[PDB]
PDB file of C-alpha atoms in Angstrom:
ATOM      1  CA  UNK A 437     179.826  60.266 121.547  1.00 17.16           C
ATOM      2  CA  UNK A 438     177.582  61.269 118.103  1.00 18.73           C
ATOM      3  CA  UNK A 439     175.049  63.661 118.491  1.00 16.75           C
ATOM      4  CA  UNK A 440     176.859  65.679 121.717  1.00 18.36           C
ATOM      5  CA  UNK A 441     178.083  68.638 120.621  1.00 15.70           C
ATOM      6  CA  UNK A 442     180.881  71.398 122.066  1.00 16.79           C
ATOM      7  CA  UNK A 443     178.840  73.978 124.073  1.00 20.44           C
ATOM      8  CA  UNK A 444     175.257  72.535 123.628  1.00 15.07           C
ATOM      9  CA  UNK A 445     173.501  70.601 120.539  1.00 16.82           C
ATOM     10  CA  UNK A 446     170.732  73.122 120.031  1.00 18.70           C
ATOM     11  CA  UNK A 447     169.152  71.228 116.344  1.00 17.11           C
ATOM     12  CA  UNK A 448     167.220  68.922 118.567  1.00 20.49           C
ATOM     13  CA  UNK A 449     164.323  70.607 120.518  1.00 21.12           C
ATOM     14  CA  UNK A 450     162.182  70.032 123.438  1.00 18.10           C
ATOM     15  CA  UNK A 451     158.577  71.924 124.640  1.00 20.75           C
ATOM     16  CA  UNK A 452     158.620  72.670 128.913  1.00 20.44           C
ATOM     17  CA  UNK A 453     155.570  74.379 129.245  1.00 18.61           C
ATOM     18  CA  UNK A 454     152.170  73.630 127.284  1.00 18.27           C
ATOM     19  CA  UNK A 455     148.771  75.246 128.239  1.00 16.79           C
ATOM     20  CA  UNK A 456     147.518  71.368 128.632  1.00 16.09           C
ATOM     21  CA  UNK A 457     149.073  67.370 129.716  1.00 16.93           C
ATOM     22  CA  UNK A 458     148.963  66.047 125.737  1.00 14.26           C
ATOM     23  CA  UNK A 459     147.200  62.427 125.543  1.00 13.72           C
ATOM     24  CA  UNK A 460     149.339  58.882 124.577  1.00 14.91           C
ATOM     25  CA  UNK A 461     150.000  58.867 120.880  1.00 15.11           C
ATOM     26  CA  UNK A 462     149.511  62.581 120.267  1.00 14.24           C
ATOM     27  CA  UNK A 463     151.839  65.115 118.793  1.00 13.75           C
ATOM     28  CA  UNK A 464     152.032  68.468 118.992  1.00 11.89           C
ATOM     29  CA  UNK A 465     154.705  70.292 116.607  1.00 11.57           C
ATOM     30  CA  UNK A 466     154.090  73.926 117.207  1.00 10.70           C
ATOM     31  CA  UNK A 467     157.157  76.255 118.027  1.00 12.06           C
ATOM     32  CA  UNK A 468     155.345  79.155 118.526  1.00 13.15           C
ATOM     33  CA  UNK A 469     155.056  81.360 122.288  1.00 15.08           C
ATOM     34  CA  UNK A 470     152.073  79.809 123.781  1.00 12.98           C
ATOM     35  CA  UNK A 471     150.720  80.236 127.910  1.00 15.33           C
ATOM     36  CA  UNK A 472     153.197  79.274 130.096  1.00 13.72           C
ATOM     37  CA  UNK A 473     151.981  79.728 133.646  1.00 12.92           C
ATOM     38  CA  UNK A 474     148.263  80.132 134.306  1.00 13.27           C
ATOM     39  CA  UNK A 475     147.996  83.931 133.106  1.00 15.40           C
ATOM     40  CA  UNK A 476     147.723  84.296 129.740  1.00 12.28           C
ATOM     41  CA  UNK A 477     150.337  86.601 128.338  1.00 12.85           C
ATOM     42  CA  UNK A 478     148.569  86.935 124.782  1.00 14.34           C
ATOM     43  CA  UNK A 479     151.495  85.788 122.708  1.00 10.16           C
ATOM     44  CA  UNK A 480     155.288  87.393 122.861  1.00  9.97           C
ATOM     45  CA  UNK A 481     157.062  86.390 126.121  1.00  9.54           C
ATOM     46  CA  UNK A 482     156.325  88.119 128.899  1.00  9.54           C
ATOM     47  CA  UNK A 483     154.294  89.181 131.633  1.00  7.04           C
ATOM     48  CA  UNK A 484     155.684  86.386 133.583  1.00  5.62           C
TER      49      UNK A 484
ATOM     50  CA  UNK B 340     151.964  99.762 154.712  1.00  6.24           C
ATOM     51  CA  UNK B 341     154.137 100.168 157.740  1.00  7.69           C
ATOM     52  CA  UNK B 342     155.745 103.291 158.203  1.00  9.42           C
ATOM     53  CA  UNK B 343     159.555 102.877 159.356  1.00  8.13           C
ATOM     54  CA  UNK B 344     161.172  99.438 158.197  1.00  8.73           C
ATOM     55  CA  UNK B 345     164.207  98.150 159.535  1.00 10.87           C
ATOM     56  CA  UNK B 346     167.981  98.184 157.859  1.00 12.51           C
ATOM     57  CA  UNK B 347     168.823  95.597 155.379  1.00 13.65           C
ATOM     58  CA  UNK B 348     171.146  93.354 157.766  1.00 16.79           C
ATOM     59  CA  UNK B 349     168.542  94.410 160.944  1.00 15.28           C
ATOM     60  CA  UNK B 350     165.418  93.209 158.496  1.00 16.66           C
ATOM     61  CA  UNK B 351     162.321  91.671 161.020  1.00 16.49           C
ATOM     62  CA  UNK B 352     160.642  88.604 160.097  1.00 20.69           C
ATOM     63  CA  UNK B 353     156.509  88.446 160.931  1.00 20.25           C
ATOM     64  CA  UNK B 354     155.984  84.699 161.334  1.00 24.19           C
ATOM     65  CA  UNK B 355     152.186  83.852 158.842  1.00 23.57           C
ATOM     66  CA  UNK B 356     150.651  80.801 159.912  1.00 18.69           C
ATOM     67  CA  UNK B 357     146.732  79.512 160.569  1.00 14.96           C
ATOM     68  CA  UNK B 358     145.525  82.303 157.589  1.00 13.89           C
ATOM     69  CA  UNK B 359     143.897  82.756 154.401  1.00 15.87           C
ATOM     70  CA  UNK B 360     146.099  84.883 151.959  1.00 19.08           C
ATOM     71  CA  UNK B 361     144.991  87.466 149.040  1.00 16.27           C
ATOM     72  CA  UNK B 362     147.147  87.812 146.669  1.00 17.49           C
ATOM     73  CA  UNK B 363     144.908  90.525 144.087  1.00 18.91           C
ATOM     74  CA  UNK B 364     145.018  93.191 146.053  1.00 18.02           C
ATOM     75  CA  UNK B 365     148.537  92.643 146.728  1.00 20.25           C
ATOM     76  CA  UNK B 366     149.436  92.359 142.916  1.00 21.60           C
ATOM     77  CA  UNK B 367     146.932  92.681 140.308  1.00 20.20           C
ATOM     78  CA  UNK B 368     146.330  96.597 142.213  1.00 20.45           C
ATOM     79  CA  UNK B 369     149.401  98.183 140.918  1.00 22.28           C
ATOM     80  CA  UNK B 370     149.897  99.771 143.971  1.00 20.99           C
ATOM     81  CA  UNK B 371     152.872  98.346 144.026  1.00 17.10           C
ATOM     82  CA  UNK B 372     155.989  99.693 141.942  1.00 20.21           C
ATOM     83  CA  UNK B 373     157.444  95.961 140.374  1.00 22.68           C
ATOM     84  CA  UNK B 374     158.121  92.578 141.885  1.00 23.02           C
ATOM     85  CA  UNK B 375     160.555  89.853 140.734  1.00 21.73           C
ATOM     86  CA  UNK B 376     159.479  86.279 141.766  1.00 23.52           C
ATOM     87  CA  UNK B 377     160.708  82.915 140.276  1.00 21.80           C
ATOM     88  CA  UNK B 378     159.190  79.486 140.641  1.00 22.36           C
ATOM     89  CA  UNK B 379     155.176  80.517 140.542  1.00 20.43           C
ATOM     90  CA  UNK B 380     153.210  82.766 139.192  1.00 24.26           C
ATOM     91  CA  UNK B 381     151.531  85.870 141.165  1.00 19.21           C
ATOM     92  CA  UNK B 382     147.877  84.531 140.074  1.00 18.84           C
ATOM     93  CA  UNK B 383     148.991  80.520 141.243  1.00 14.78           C
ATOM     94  CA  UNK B 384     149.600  81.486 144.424  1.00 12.44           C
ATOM     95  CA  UNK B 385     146.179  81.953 145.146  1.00 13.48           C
ATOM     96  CA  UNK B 386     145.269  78.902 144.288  1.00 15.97           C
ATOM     97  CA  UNK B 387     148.506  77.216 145.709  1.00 12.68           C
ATOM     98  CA  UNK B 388     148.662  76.926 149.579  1.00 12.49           C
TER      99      UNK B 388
END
């Protein structure tokens, strides 16, 4: 009822895909395009 | 590499079971024009069975 917004509440933000599991108690703030599967796409999205 | 397919509504299915699977020669050869494939990677399913 608060922070739902009308077609999606983008401000908050959530990372799928990380080249590694991160440990209890760690953070991890980085935004930028990283590995998603397990071929490196060196950077912009891509290259599946 | 077959040389005559079948239509698109008379398509044949070849049942793979009991084998090992390559997948570089299949992809990573650019033999092959493009491919479109969502859920895995070419390169995981190699190492996915």
């Amino acid at each position: 009822n608060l922070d739902s917004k009308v077609g999606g509440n983008y401000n908050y933000l959530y990372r799928l895909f990380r080249k590694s599991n991160l440990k209890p108690f760690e953070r991890d703030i980085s935004t930028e395009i990283y590995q998603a599967g397990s071929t490196p796409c060196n950077g912009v999205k891509g290259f599946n | 590499n077959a040389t005559r397919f079948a239509s698109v509504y008379a398509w044949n299915r070849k049942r793979i079971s009991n084998c090992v699977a390559d997948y570089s020669v299949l992809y990573n050869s650019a033999s092959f024009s493009t491919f479109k494939c969502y859920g895995v990677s070419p390169t995981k399913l190699n190492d996915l069975c």
